[PDB]
Design a protein around this ligand. Structure first.
Ligand SMILES: CCCCCCCCOCCOCCOCCOCCO
Ligand SMILES: CCCCCCCCOCCOCCOCCOCCO
Ligand SMILES: CCCCCCCCOCCOCCOCCOCCO
Ligand SMILES: CCCCCCCCOCCOCCOCCOCCO
Ligand SMILES: CCCCCCCCOCCOCCOCCOCCO
Ligand SMILES: CCCCCCCCOCCOCCOCCOCCO
Ligand SMILES: *SCC1=CC(C)(C)N(O)C1(C)C
Ligand SMILES: [Mg+2]
Ligand SMILES: [Mg+2]
Ligand SMILES: [Mg+2]
Ligand SMILES: [Mg+2]
Ligand SMILES: [Mg+2]
Ligand SMILES: [Mg+2]
Ligand SMILES: [Mg+2]
Ligand SMILES: [Mg+2]
Ligand SMILES: [Mg+2]
Length: 548
């Protein structure tokens, strides 16, 4: 029920007018996900493509938007792995760290700045759940996982969290994760934290990625006033063999929010520096980019109406000043039913390669989105449902000009989509269903954009019988257009749609020991999300956790 992703501070989801999805760790353990993509692919509006199995490059297409038009936050801060390519790829991010996901669709540059065009995915790594745990798993393709985790009180008012994880999967991918946290309450209103973690990955032509992130902050959580001051530093090193991509990202943010009337008003200032090593991302020199943004947010309930807003101004060391804004109005016209209307602008900053690489244009402006969305939400006969339509006009897309061998702002895209979701129970069965239609086109030429499913259906059915907890996952991935690079001029090819099924079980052997089982791709269906790149096939997994 609570989220922080909408305006940075806690609020109930019912008061967030944008469609909103929350995934908890209970969900991730039940689903038996061995990657971040597997979690995300289940959610509304998400279309993930991957050059094969785990560890391989991937892209996230939220609601038809480009790969680079989703904002991935880790504990509220822009994902470091995204900064060199300017495009979020979570294949290397360790699933072991994911305690919660809050995923908000629709624009949100008016709070977060760059990249929040299709939506915002915030991966949270914090848990409140004392104790010690050991866990492990084996599966198909010699998959193997071991994991030790711990959270305990060091006296009154201070807690410590530790975790280590080893994951390995042949064709392949090797991941080692370490994470520690200290949380401290100076009073019941004032809190502080220091966090550090990092991970060492190898992917097979070989890839050796290493990242470490450190975060530190103060929060004030009062009856009316809420405040946060947060510091983050990330250092990544990305070897392909040989080529080295290295980036340091520093972040400081100060936000406040106060409860006023039946809602709130907030403001903050957001500063970001990114330094890259020479040769990073096929750019010759090392670069230092800086961004500052100041934004305002507000929520109010009057009568049957809810109004939500945000507005931001970003000053970028390369393109200068760009402003964004968004509003939503919602009207509960009969109890349990609501009509919601939203408008929002957002942007994407140019990336290092586009700006300074062999074909760079140092004068590029940001890509700009205007979105309109309308929705009906309802609770009918024990069924919670919602249906939205949205229109997204993207312009000044950064395209390569083949005649002058330089990038320019010129492209246009028009995306018209529909999202429909419902959840409900039938006796002991729980159903979670969504449907997405996404008509994403080049607006000059009126031709469909490549790499995106026009349609997806997603169905989750959970139930408990003896003490077995069962979960079935269904996905239809619709027809998709891609290019075939095996032959030049590269031809556009049509990839047929596919139905995919998973089956997962959990059993508490004792009150301390849970054993779990999964068959991913129950019908050994052969398919690609990227033309040429074979996906998994039926895989089996068998795992356990021991708590004390
Ligand atoms: C005191 C400032 C609160 C508003 C900040 C964000 C406003 C963004 O644009 C809204 C203006 O245009 C639409 C007017 O309708 C509702 C305004 O938002 C009310 C916020 O609770
Ligand atoms: C806190 C509230 C923020 C609300 C912002 C409203 C949106 C700004 O639109 C007002 C008009 O916008 C510009 C129109 O004309 C000037 C620009 O056109 C020429 C291009 O440079
Ligand atoms: C207290 C923080 C207020 C931050 C508000 C900035 C709102 C962002 O602008 C709204 C969208 O931008 C539209 C106007 O952009 C053109 C800038 O005009 C500059 C003055 O000529
Ligand atoms: C696109 C949204 C359309 C929503 C239509 C809903 C209109 C009214 O629906 C519910 C009205 O209540 C009727 C339900 O049956 C009454 C149950 O009440 C129990 C005791 O009176
Ligand atoms: C109020 C939620 C809208 C539900 C949409 C389904 C009804 C379709 O009726 C009209 C046909 O729409 C044609 C275009 O379809 C994609 C449009 O998506 C919205 C952007 O305009
Ligand atoms: C869907 C229009 C009817 C009113 C909303 C009912 C709630 C929808 O919840 C079910 C979501 O499940 C799949 C719905 O698929 C059909 C809707 O697609 C329409 C595309 O234009
Ligand atoms: S949960 C981490 C932890 C708690 C305590 C028992 C105090 N420790 O020595 C470690 C650091 C293992
Ligand atoms: Mg091995
Ligand atoms: Mg203090
Ligand atoms: Mg107070
Ligand atoms: Mg403070
Ligand atoms: Mg500073
Ligand atoms: Mg509308
Ligand atoms: Mg010519
Ligand atoms: Mg189809
Ligand atoms: Mg096979």
């Amino acid at each position: 029920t609570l989220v922080v992703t909408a305006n940075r501070f806690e609020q109930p989801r019912s008061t967030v007018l944008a469609p909103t999805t929350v995934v908890t760790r209970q969900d991730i353990d039940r689903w038996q996900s061995t990657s971040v993509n597997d979690v995300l692919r289940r959610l509304p509006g998400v279309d993930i493509t991957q050059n094969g199995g785990s560890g391989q490059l991937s892209s996230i297409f939220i609601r038809g938007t480009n790969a680079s038009h989703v904002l991935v936050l880790i504990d509220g801060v822009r994902l470091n792995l995204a900064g060199v390519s300017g495009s979020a790829d979570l294949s290397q991010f360790p699933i072991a760290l994911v305690q919660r996901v809050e995923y908000i669709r629709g624009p949100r540059s008016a709070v977060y700045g760059s990249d929040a065009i299709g939506g915002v995915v915030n991966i949270i790594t914090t848990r409140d759940e004392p104790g010690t745990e050991i866990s492990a798993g084996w599966g198909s393709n010699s998959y193997q996982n071991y994991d030790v985790s711990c959270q305990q009180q060091l006296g009154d008012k201070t807690r410590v969290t530790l975790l280590g994880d080893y994951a390995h999967t042949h064709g392949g991918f090797l991941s080692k994760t370490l994470y520690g946290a200290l949380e401290h309450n100076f009073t019941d209103a004032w809190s502080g934290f220091v966090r550090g973690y990092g991970y060492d990955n190898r992917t097979n032509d070989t890839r050796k990625l290493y990242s470490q992130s450190w975060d530190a902050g103060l929060r004030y959580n009062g009856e009316l006033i809420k405040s946060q001051l947060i510091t983050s530093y990330s250092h990544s090193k990305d070897y392909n063999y040989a080529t080295l991509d290295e980036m340091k990202q520093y972040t400081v943010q100060w936000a406040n929010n106060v409860i006023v009337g039946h809602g709130s008003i907030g403001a903050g200032v957001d500063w970001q520096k990114q330094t890259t090593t020479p040769g990073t991302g096929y750019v010759e020199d090392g670069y230092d980019q800086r961004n500052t943004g100041i934004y305002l947010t507000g929520l109010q309930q009057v009568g049957d109406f809810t109004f939500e807003g945000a507005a931001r101004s970003d000053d970028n060391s390369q393109f200068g000043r760009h402003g964004t804004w968004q509003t939503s109005a919602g009207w509960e016209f009969i109890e349990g039913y609501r009509f919601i209307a939203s408008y929002g602008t957002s942007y994407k900053a140019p990336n290092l390669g586009q700006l300074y690489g062999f074909y760079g244009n140092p004068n590029l402006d940001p890509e700009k989105s205007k979105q309109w969305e309308g929705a009906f939400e309802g609770l009918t006969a024990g069924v919670n449902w919602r249906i939205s339509g949205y229109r997204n006009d993207v312009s000044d897309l950064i395209d390569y000009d083949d005649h002058t061998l330089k990038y320019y702002n010129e492209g246009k895209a028009r995306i018209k989509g529909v999202e429909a979701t419902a959840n409900f129970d039938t006796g002991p069965l729980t159903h979670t269903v969504s449907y997405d239609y996404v008509d994403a086109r080049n607006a000059i030429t009126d031709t469909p954009l490549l790499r995106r499913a026009k349609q997806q259906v997603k169905y989750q059915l959970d139930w408990q019988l003896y003490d077995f907890d069962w979960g079935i996952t269904y996905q239809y991935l619709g027809t998709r257009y891609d290019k075939d690079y095996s032959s030049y001029p590269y031809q556009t090819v049509k990839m047929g749609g596919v139905s995919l099924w998973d089956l997962a079980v959990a059993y508490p052997v004792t009150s301390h020991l849970t054993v779990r089982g999964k068959i991913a791709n129950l019908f050994d269906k052969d398919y690609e999300t990227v033309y040429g790149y074979q996906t998994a096939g039926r895989e089996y997994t068998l795992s356990g956790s021991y708590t004390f």
